[PDB]
Amino acid sequence: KEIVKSNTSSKKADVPPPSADPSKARKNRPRPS
Amino acid sequence: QKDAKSSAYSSRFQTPFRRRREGKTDYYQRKRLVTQHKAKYNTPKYRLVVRFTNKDIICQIISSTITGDVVLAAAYSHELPRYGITHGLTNWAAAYATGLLIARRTLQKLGLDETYKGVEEVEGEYELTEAVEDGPRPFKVFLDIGLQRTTTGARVFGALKGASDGGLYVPHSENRFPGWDFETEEIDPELLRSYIFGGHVSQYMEELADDDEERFSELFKGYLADDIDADSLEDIYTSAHEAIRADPAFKPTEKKFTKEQYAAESKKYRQTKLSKEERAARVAAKIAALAGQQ
Amino acid sequence: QNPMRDLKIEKLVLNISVGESGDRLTRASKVLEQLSGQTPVQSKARYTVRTFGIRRNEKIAVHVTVRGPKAEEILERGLKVKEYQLRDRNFSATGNFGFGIDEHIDLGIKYDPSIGIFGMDFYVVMNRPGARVTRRKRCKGTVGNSHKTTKEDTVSWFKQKYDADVLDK
Amino acid sequence: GKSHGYRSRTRYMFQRDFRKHGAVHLSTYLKVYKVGDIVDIKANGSIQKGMPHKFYQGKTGVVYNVTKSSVGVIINKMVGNRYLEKRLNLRVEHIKHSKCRQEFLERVKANAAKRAEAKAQGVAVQLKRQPAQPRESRIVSTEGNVPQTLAPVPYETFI
Amino acid sequence: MTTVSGRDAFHLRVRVHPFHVLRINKMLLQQGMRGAWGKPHGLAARVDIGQIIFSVRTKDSNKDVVVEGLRRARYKFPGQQKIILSKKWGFTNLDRPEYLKKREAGEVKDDGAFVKFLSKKGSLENNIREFPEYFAAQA
């Protein structure tokens, strides 16, 4: 069988939450060598 | 947990009805159970309240008043010893029994009991209690399930089949009685009759005593100790309905100690609340106690 | 005091976040299906992310919930890989804890190239006896403060059994 | 263009009371309404069915009908220079027995009884209300009460 | 004030904010009086009679320089405003006596800028913690 979890949320808009936003990050980041 | 509630939060917080907080009353279904056709005025809709606690079954016939709900009659599964049942006091068969008793008990003290007998045969048939043509209509009641989950085979519909078969007109349908085949869209009255007489418990006792002497002798430690054999189960229940219809009326327990007496002892384990005087006294002490930079 | 508030693993949820629909997901599911002997539930994207390549309501990941003895043994098979050492992170403020592993073959499990290699997330949630008080339909209540799981408690649970190590600050 | 919709102007009228939202309690469904009953009207905005129109808010009338989930109330509405008679169909959630009507009946019973006891002595009654009379003479005493005598207070700013 | 008697010698605070928008029509056949609603023109602070406009706190002896500082702003304000020196410690309430009693009792702890006060309301492990000096043996 194929089973799909249900998302209790109300939101309907294909939109990333304010929890997105590319301000906040790092100049750092694990940069491979 | 450092999620402290502001006063802003606390103040504008509107509380649910008390019994809602308690997770006991579902007020959205209570409305639709209680409310009368306004042109039927003061005629009470009566509820068949059925409840299961871990060790008991509660059955009440209730109506509502502004000043509070009101019970016509109640029966309990813990009554059933008197009618000859001493084990599985919250199983399906126990329901049908307490469901029967509440039925026969009310319309006894209603005078409806001499007419409207119910079934007496009991062979797991789906049928309602049709009205004696040309005379009193059967006492009508509606199944309050409370917060019980409408599953097909639920103990709570046991008390329904016991209460219908008891003569009470209690409007219902097959599809939640044990032995409803959602594919057959049909009921097997066999399975249902079986369940009325504890047929599902008996089979298990055998299965167990045969395949697990140790476990059986634990789950049914109390049957061994009473010499109750598995296959004798049906008779216990059968002769119980018998006994029930025979004397449905309620005898209360005899009680030691006065109604008042209990009080005078009971909560002398009642933590007594302070008067303002020693309360302030309490803290004017508490200050000196802490009044120093530590 | 210490009688019945005895504290145990509530459950363990394995999570493989494949980050893309299709075969690579259906395969990672098999992996999760074999390991648990249960059927796993796939989850879907909450919203489109372009730099990730996921369309909203695309199936993306897959997870399975395990309780009791089989969880207690997959928790084991996992702590094996982590060489019985976790950090002072991994342990949340609400008594739970988890860890992650690359390649599932590091815990029993034959290779099989028809599948391939998947890493996964282990997260075990810890409660005590009596938790159904917050779970049942009727009289839904909430676990008294003195009861209920904390990071102090459930770390030094994890230490005394497993004999394992918890590192750093 | 102007706007005169059916629930216009009723942003606060059909608003719920502060910290009294959600479920309407069950007292409201247990009350029983007969014809000739006198009811106040006060819409519950959560019960969108069988609402009074906003005009009839706060008006009081008589039951001319008792249907399943509603009463019919007769309201006398002034329109132009004459009163017109209005038939309203309100669900029970927007209605309320009138207290002053219940006090009246109590006083009718009270009046019958006072009349009994009186006539069961052939004596007189006065059953009808008299308004607040003047005041008969009094003699205030001065013992413990030698009149503290007051005077006006000087001006004084304080900022 | 800052020149006659030096920067750190006072705290002058404007006690009314220009919150109320003003409009003009602006008569750009001239349009007329048709549709005469205004564009915003500038801000004004709606002020009552008796309402404080400027407040200055300073050292008890700077009084004179400070008053002259107000009677000089005054000439820049339409209408009549009084210069009133307030029997009251600083920008606090409490008329200077009363303020001092509470200082020699330890109920007043220097919060930044303004100040905090010790109540007989909260939980002691806070009231005691926040104001040690009120509940110490120290005179």
Next chain:
RNA sequence: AAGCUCGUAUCAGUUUUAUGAGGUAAAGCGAAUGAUUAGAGGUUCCGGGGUCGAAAUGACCUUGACCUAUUCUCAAACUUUAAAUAUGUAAGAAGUCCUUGUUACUUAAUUGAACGUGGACAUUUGAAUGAAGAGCUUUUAGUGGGCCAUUUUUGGUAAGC
């Protein structure tokens, strides 16, 4: 205008008693929402910039950001609170109680719900004041540019706007 049916009665641009409805004035903002000045303390273990062993998945720091307790100021389209003035209904004969009749409605039910028979209570028959009489029908004129004052108030710099 023409009257008509009656004649103390049912009335009323009013008070009183009883009981409703309202969100304006004020008020509030260390209450919700939206604004707004200022410090103070506290988090970054998760934006950033350096200085220190270039050291820094380490500190001291200033910077934001958010957090906490405070602080100055605000709202026609904000608000817990919340007036005054206005505003609904009631104050009995078409009433009250007692007996019990009808029905196909309604009730488990001779239960109710409507509508009645028979009986009982006519001194204040159920507040005040007034009533120059109450009710009612038919038909038809002119009018359908208004303006002014106190107060409330919108537009406008304002106006005999």
Next chain:
RNA sequence: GAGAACAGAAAUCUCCAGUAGAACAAAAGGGUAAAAGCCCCCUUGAUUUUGAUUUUCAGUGUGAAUACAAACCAUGAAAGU
């Protein structure tokens, strides 16, 4: 907010807090928390008959709505809707 391989501000998983700060096609306002919101199961009451009523009102029309009556159906264990 605290937590979990690749995994980053942002993917999926867990716990905790959470009076609604969300969602209910749309303007805004009201209303709603075991729901009026999210997931799911079954459905055509979006039907038939012709009257009464509320708003605007002349107490005409229109649009919209409300409460019954007589049918025929849907759903639910049911009261109900």
Next chain:
RNA sequence: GGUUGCGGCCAUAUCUACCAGAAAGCACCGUUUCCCGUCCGAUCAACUGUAGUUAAGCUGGUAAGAGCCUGACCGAGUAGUGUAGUGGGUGACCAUACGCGAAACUCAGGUGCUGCAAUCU
């Protein structure tokens, strides 16, 4: 008086922290043959009342606790307001006369009451 089932009114009942709770009840709790529902007997379903425990739910007590509730010549007859004048003032505005009358503030008290039924040292 305790407790339970169904309630009324819906914070004097809510929130946070910490103690306590005899007896019965309620609970947690044991089990998965059966009807039944889950990714997961966790929830839901059934079985036993048997192996266990008041640890939690629950119940009360504590707290110069947060909130909420009540009161007061606390602020205040303040703000606002109905009526009156050929009242004051250049005016904004103000006072008087017949009346009504708040909020913020301050302090003081309080922290569920209650109906039906069953049951209990």
